[PDB]
Structure 1
Amino acid sequence: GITGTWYNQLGSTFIVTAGADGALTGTYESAVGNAESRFVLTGRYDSAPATDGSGTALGWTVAWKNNYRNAHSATTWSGQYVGGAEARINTQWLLTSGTTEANAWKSTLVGHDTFTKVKP
């Protein structure tokens, strides 16, 4: 249920393959339709989730370096997949930039993204 394409509510999209034993691998495109905005992502998921209706825990990282861009930063998304009609991956994220020590206190942004199988 995880393998495939997902869209957040703001114009990003990623493509992921969920390996049989817990690997996540794919590509994150921060601006739909812009190939210069595609970055590697890698992560993990629970490959034997509960069968009681609960979601499937997962996480992934994108370091914002590709051939076109280096933001000197990385985002991690932590969340759960919820299957069915209206499947979704509900996440909260942390975006850390490399900083000097004086600026470390402002290194890390927090937010949330809801991913769906259809565009907003």
Structure 2
Amino acid sequence: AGITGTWYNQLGSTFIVTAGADGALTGTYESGNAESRYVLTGRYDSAPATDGSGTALGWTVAWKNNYRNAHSATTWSGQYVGGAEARINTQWLXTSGTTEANAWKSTLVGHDTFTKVKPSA
């Protein structure tokens, strides 16, 4: 509950997601041209605690579509926090395909927060 919808991060990328009754996340991630749209899939806790805790979840986008392939994939891990203004707070890992000699620089890390409203600025 509450997860399905369109979400926007602080840099205005758009995460359109559906949360299925089974725990599945499915949808699209973009930033508005078709060439910038990618499939996403993930999982979320479909029976969260009832004590005030958020709902754990995660998803992946591989950065290949019909138009572009960056040979890389990002995973977001986080929790949905419901209520007045719902947010999803995440930290993410992007791994690029590398040779073994370059594997030490394969993975970037950062954090994104998503709300159902587009950001200002």
Fold conserved (TM > 0.5)?
A: yes
Following superposition, the deviation at residue 118 of structure 1 comes to 0.2
2:72 corresponding residue in structure 1? 73
Following superposition, the deviation at residue 10 of structure 1 comes to 0.3
5+ residue gaps, structure 1: none
Q: Percent identity?
A: 98
Mapping of 1:1-120 within 5 angstroms? Answer: 1-30=2-31, 33-120=32-119
5+ residue gaps, structure 2: none
Deviations for 1:49-95, whole angstroms, at most 9, x for unmatched residues? 00111000000000000011100000000000001111000000000
Following superposition, the deviation at residue 35 of structure 1 comes to 2.1
Matches of 2:4 and 2:97, distance apart in 1:
31
Matches of 1:11 and 1:79, distance apart in 2:
18
Deviations for 1:14-65, whole angstroms, at most 9, x for unmatched residues? 10000001000000003xx222111000000000000111000000000000
Matches of 1:88 and 1:35, distance apart in 2:
26
Matches of 2:112 and 2:93, distance apart in 1:
11
Three-state SS of the structure 1 residue aligned to 2:60 is strand
Matches of 2:34 and 2:53, distance apart in 1:
35
Given the two structures, how large is their TM-score scaled by the length of structure 2? 0.96
Following superposition, the deviation at residue 111 of structure 1 comes to 0.2
**CA RMSD, Structure 1 to Structure 2 (Å):** 0.6
Structure 1 runs (4+) deviating above 4 angstroms are: none
Pairs aligned (count) = 118
